A paper describes a structure:
To better understand the mechanism by which PHF23PHD recognizes the histone tail, we determined the protein structure. Although PHF23PHD was crystallized in the presence of H3K4me3 peptide, unexpectedly we obtained the structure in which the N-terminal sequence of one PHF23PHD molecule was bound to the second PHF23PHD molecule. Alignment of this structure with the structures of other [name] fingers, such as of KDM5A and BPTF in complex with H3K4me3 peptides (see discussion below), revealed that the N-terminal sequence DLIT (residues 338–341 of PHF23PHD) and a preceding serine derived from the vector superimpose very well with H3K4me3 in the KDM5A and BPTF complexes. Much like H3K4me3, the SDLIT sequence is bound in an extended conformation and pairs with the β1 strand of PHF23PHD, which results in the formation of the three-stranded antiparallel β-sheet. The I340 side chain occupies the aromatic/hydrophobic cage of PHF23PHD consisting of F348, M353, and W362 with another hydrophobic residue, L339 being positioned to make an additional wall of the cage. Mapping the most perturbed residues of the protein (due to binding of H3K4me3) on the surface of PHF23PHD confirmed that H3K4me3 occupies the same binding pocket of PHF23PHD as the SDLIT sequence. Of note, I340 in the SDLIT sequence superimposes well with the hydrophobic part of the K4me3 side chain, further suggesting that lysine mimetics could also occupy the aromatic cage. Substitution of either M353 with valine or W362 with alanine abolished the interaction with H3K4me3, and replacement of F348 with alanine led to protein unfolding, suggesting a role of this residue in structural stability of PHF23PHD.
In the [name]–[name] chimera, the amino-terminal portion of [name] with multiple GLFG repeats is fused to the carboxy-terminal portion of [name] that contains a single [name] finger (PHF23PHD). In this study, we report molecular mechanisms for the recognition of methylated histone H3K4 by the [name] finger of [name] and inhibition of this interaction by small molecule compounds DS and amiodarone (AD). In contrast, H3K4me1 and H3K4me0 peptides induced CSP in PHF23PHD in fast exchange regime, and plotting these resonance changes against peptide concentration yielded Kds of 580 μM and 1.6 mM, respectively. These results suggest that PHF23PHD selects for the higher methylation state of H3K4 (tri- and dimethylated) and discriminates against monomethylated (H3K4me1) or unmodified H3. Collectively, our data indicate an overall similar mode of action for these [name] fusions during AML development that depends on binding of their [name] fingers to H3K4me3, a mark enriched at promoters of actively transcribed genes.
Numbering used by the authors: 337 to 385
Write the structure that this text describes.
Amino acid sequence: SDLITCYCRKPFAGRPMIECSLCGTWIHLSCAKIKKTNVPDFFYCQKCK
Ligand SMILES: [Zn+2]
């Protein structure tokens, strides 16, 4: 049984996800507009910034 934590109402489903460095919620990297080639050391979601 999978989890939904990202703001697009869609579950993990094997998709890479990054943690909100502040609120802790897990955001799909695609939704966070993050390329696998450049990944922030600290990430902040829309709610927390
Ligand atoms: Zn997502």
